[PDB]
Amino acid sequence: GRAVPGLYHHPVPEPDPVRVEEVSRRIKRWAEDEVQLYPGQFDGFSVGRYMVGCHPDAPTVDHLMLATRLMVAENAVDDCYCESPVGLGGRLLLAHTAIDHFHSTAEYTPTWQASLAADAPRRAYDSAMGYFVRAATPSQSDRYRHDMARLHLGYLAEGAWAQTGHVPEVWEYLAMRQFNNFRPCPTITDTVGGYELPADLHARPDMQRVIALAGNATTIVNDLYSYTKELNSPGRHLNLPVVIAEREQLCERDAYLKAVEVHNELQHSFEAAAADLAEACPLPPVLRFLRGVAAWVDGNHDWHRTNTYRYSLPDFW
Amino acid sequence: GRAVPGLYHHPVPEPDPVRVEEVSRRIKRWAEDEVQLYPGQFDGFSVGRYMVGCHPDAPTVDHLMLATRLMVAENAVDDCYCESPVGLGGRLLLAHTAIDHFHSTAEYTPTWQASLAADAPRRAYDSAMGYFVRAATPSQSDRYRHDMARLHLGYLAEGAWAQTGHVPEVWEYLAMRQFNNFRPCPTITDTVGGYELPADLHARPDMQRVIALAGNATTIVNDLYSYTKELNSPGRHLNLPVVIAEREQLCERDAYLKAVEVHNELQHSFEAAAADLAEACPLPPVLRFLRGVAAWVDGNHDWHRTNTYRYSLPDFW
């Protein structure tokens, strides 16, 4: 329950247990009844607290469920596909067509259509994206598809390196982790909050830097909380402390403490860039979106800190 | 110089030789002087005719050069990286950061910055995208990055299959080819034409189907013209006739003729969907963009038909 010592973060209120329970019951029903996700590790309570904590402005549980089904589907892919298969690029492209559809001839379209029911990851993406596309504006859907293309490219860099046991330089690992990253989750904060960050404002270079820094900081949070778990993962699973240690030839402890400082610099930079843009462009949807990304990041730190079933901390302090 | 018999296409005017020559001289200078592309196969005349023919509405050669440097950079990646490396996913993600930049700490940012000069593909993307970002709106830049993420995912499906000599089902091959696809070229037709298709109109589902069908048809054109060349490529290089033949157990000839019919159905569907959207949404930028995608597709068919240095036709008629 303790935060990583020295990790810069902001406390968050206990998530509303009425919403956590309602999310938990509905996501279990979606998993079992609509997409047949499994035949435990899956808990509804875990993801319910996660999403309530990360989206305090959601008007309804229906809004929370848009993010929740997409998070569960993302998990199902990383679980069924990403553990390192040589054939990953083919599997992931076909699953990506549940997110960005295939357009083809009368002959081939139905065969693709049938593939969307073929396994749990595609049933999960097809169904989760279908609820999102109904709720969100076409620009919000397109933005999510781009963030998912980023994430799939991220997985495929990590998998290519794992095929040869390659340890990239630290900045190379960080570049992969900018893509293989929580980013598709905080960037839907506007859809989940029932409003829209207009596309031309999303596309501003300064906003794109804000989003990347937030995703980068909050993904390094996961490196830090999941570091001890990953020591048992197959092969040598990369995370920032492992890569710094191996490339910079540092003991695990000193590498882990430097990773904490890297996280802090990213989090502070995210905050300064967000403050600058809020001043440069104080339109209400921009300010709402920036606050919502911050809330997602703080909520993601809280979930990792409290999830003692998935994570524990190394003995370094 | 002859078109594939039975291939549905539209003739185009001979490209303006004054513009072809000016594009040729400037792209050779960019290649040699700015990005050190090589130490022949590269001709300026080839790509000059290509881009003039595909962008008849470009106001200036500067506009044509925005597309031309990006096409040459795309080629450089496919040439230096894609021929099948196990480490492709890592190489391509790092090159993608020349298109969608890395955001990191004061320590790691400059090391990434130096990597953008490290090889010809990254110097080519960094420089070509830098001219594009200066010219285009932030929404047009963001749209190009998404189309490049699609293309890199496409390469990585093709490379994952090539690692095991896997022949996917035909619709699976077509799904990969929807991504590994000319799409990033016709979708910049508005930037090259000096106007903007507004982002919310680009994101409409019907427009996204139009774009996918156009890219799919015009990419299958390349399968058909490059079929005889690819028979000498390493391994068994996939294209629609090869995949249909191997999965459907047809002789090469009958598979090739069916591929021509598939191309035709995609091209007709593209046209019908474009006509429907022009009627549904007759705003001038939409109608300009649809005409510009059509011109790119017709120009791409013409370039393949006339490029007897890269391509020849099989003896099937």
Ligand SMILES: CC(C)=CCC/C(C)=C/CSP(=O)(O)OP(=O)(O)O
């Ligand atoms: C879009 C979503 C949910 C995730 C993006 C990929 C991602 C950041 C997964 C969480 S990080 P990962 O190291 O892979 O997972 P853990 O086992 O450490 O929990």
Ligand SMILES: CC(C)=CCC/C(C)=C/CSP(=O)(O)OP(=O)(O)O
């Ligand atoms: C964005 C650009 C230029 C290309 C996208 C990838 C693409 C369609 C390359 C042309 S198809 P490809 O079979 O790879 O090349 P060819 O040797 O047949 O000429």
Ligand SMILES: [Mg+2]
């Ligand atoms: Mg992972």
Ligand SMILES: [Mg+2]
């Ligand atoms: Mg982890």
Ligand SMILES: [Mg+2]
């Ligand atoms: Mg290729």
Ligand SMILES: [Mg+2]
């Ligand atoms: Mg080809």
